[PDB]
Amino acid sequence: TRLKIVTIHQEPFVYVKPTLSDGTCKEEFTVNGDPVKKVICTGPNDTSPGSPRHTVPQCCYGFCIDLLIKLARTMNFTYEVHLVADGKFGTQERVNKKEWNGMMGELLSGQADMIVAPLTINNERAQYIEFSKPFKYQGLTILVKKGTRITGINDPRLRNPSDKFIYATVKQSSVDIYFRRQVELSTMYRHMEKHNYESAAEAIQAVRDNKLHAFIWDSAVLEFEASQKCDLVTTGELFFRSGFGIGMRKDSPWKQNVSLSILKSHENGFMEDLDKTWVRYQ
Amino acid sequence: NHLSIVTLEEAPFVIVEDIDPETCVRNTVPCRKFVKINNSTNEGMNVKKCCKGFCIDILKKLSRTVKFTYDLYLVTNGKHGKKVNNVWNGMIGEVVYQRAVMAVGSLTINEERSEVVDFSVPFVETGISVMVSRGTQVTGLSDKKFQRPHDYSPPFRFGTVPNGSTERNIRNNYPYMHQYMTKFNQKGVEDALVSLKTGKLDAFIYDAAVLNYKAGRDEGCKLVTIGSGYIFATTGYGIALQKGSPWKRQIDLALLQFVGDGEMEELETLWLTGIC
Ligand SMILES: O=C(NCc1cccnc1)c1ccc(CNS(=O)(=O)c2ccc(F)cc2)cc1
Ligand SMILES: N[C@@H](CCC(=O)O)C(=O)O
Ligand SMILES: [Ca+2]
Missing domain, CATH: 3.40.190.10 (Periplasmic binding protein-like II)
Structure with missing residues (x-):
């Protein structure tokens, strides 16, 4: 299917950069000399609260983007990456009625099909969404x-x-x-x-x-x-x-295989490779 | 509401004791162990035993929070879980073949087990660690001493306790290392530790959580895990349930509530903290 993925700016998991003049991403090499796999992600530019949000194409890469690409090719699916409009992870706030904001809000309202970001597993979120087995402890x-x-x-x-x-x-x-x-x-x-x-x-x-x-x-x-x-x-x-x-709705048909891919990746070293590439150097 | 639960002895997660003279007292719960009469019969007796530890305390909290009663028994058909001739033994097997509603213990979450049972959220971070005598130079699992053992003269002596998640991972990832190290297969943790200290073994590859517990309580702080007590193939211990079990949702929420309420840290403080 064509999954709408939601993410957040958060180094070294997700680096966010402007595209070049022609709307492409500048070619880069990792700390190990391999080329950096970049995706086009749409998101707002201005980060001033209570202001209009103008969405623009941007370049996304990092630990979480490589994980996205690995999951996408393992489970054979296509995607569209976007940045959370309010720039927040997500909490349930009182407005009697309690509402979700951030990536949590975007996932529950159907604005996103999946959260691929450093999103913490907790009691509050797990009541409303499906979490995969952890991709990072x-x-x-x-x-x-x-x-x-x-x-x-x-x-x-x-x-x-x-x-x-x-x-x-x-x-x-x-x-x-x-x-x-x-x-x-x-x-x-x-x-x-x-x-x-x-x-x-x-x-x-x-x-x-x-x-x-x-x-x-x-x-x-x-x-x-x-x-x-x-x-x-x-x-x-x-x-x-x-x-x-990884966060998905409780009705998602990808739940089982998202978690099996994650477990597989820790076991075969792919997860260790990601840490060697993005997290542990200098 | 009255659920059959399987467990296995692995200190400090699950500790087995004799009944006091005449039942189970204090922080202990009743557990039963089927003990055979002889080996020329299938007959046996369920010996009343007592169980305690980190995993037993989690089971108590789950019992009162999720609201269920249980009959706890100890696995006799193997240990944690191994797929022999496409048939599962151990705690995994007891759940797969519906002899138990759930498995509680030092049960590692891995991909092949997750295809046949459902696991709760992890409640103890684990994976693979290496235990050596302090001063021993091994970079990690990918060290040549492990990878190409016969390039060294004499070669490095290292082993594991076979049939668990550690040996399985080693078999899949490092075929040569695996076939060399079967010569150094240990019966259990206690045997391995004795073997290290007396210079009969150079490294012991095993469950990160148990290795870090043993390193912390080691007399003289002689035995250490390599790196900062580094974990390869990081995973967790989880509750194994049957595929599509109606208990999972409430078990995951209750475990996550214990994390958020501060109850998990009190359990880590009582049972898992060490001197070293
Ligand atoms: O404190 C936790 N367990 C105690 C402990 C003691 C020794 C080593 N590891 C964990 C815990 C459990 C579940 C979560 C939430 N789920 S999780 O899968 O994201 C996870 C993260 C870190 C963990 F250590 C275990 C599980 C958080 C903390
Ligand atoms: N926790 C492990 C114990 C044995 C091992 O480290 O291989 C398991 O469930 O298999
Ligand atoms: Ca979908």
Whole structure:
């Protein structure tokens, strides 16, 4: 079938770039000298909240795009990639009536047929959608500027906060709902909800610019950022374990074979190859 | 509502004990083990035993959350699961051939098993790890010592416990390594660990979760997993259910709720943490 795939900008899983003048993608080589497989993805350009969204063709590539191509050729299907219009992962928010936003909203409203992005498996999302077996096992860590002394999650500058040390996550993401629903994490959520960022990139930028002192997010992203920017470090190891899965509607006929392909890929090394290509270098 | 459940002893996930003098006390639940009278008969007795561990505590929480009662028994037809002559033994086989509603234990999720049973969401990250004596230089599974063993004089001595998901993966991915290492097949984890420490073996390739548990509680911290306790072919332990089972939806949601509520971390803290 012709599957409408939804994704999100999130390095090194999905890099988003403008096309050249002729609407094509510039040829690139990986860290290993192999050519980069790029797809055309449509998505909005302006990232200012409460503004009109003008969709344009763009170039998508990365860990998740190679996974898409592998799944597509393994299960023999065609696709169209688009970027989530609101630029969010997805949470269920109260408007009595509760509505889904982000990729979750696009999948449930029929705007997308499949989520191929670093989307965390959780209780909330699993009630409404089918998740594949995880394509990546990881968790939560904390990103700080080199020099910022922080122990981890049990540090007094997070457990007993003030306006002197600002920390945050990404709005309407799984990290955000994790802190919201956990009563032990209540004091932290109260601080974070005044400071959360629209996107992971803006938060990473804010930590470099000394505007945000700590960014709480996925270790697969934060460890990659710290491996690329020498002014950034992660603090401690994982304080909470989580994994990324492919998302489909519960009525999807691709459910069984999406998961078998994923299991197959971890077992034969394809998943390790993706990590060698996109995640682990420098 | 009253479900037959199969399990297998593999500490700290499932620990088997004798009944106290006169039933199962404290953090333990009743489990039954069919024990044969002799080998010139098919007759046997169901010995009342007691079960505990990380996987048993998950089963307790699932029992109260999903609302079901159960009769827990220990597999006697092999272990975890192996497809012999296109027929499944172990916990997998007990579920495939409908002798059990579900399998709970240190049961690895893999592709061939997922074709015949349904697995819940993973609740323990696992895969393949390598256990060596501290200081041993092996890059990983793809190290030449493993890949082309006879290029070394003397060759590197390494083995696994056969018939599990680890040997299966090795057989499929590294034919030469596999045929060389069958000479070093170990009966169980305890035998392998003794073999490493006494210098009878150089590496033991096995389940990441059990290896990292054993490395953490090792006397003197002599035995380590290679890399940062690196995992190849990352997967998880899951609950095996029958294909199209009406229990899956509620089992997955309850496990994901334990993750989100903080209950999984308390279980990891009690049962899995070590010194090293
Ligand atoms: O904390 C979890 N288990 C305890 C544990 C102890 C030692 C090693 N690994 C996991 C857990 C379970 C399920 C999910 C959600 N599902 S998942 O498949 O994305 C997954 C991610 C990471 C995991 F470690 C296990 C499963 C998250 C966390
Ligand atoms: N957890 C493994 C145990 C044996 C192995 O590591 O091969 C299984 O279910 O087969
Ligand atoms: Ca479809």
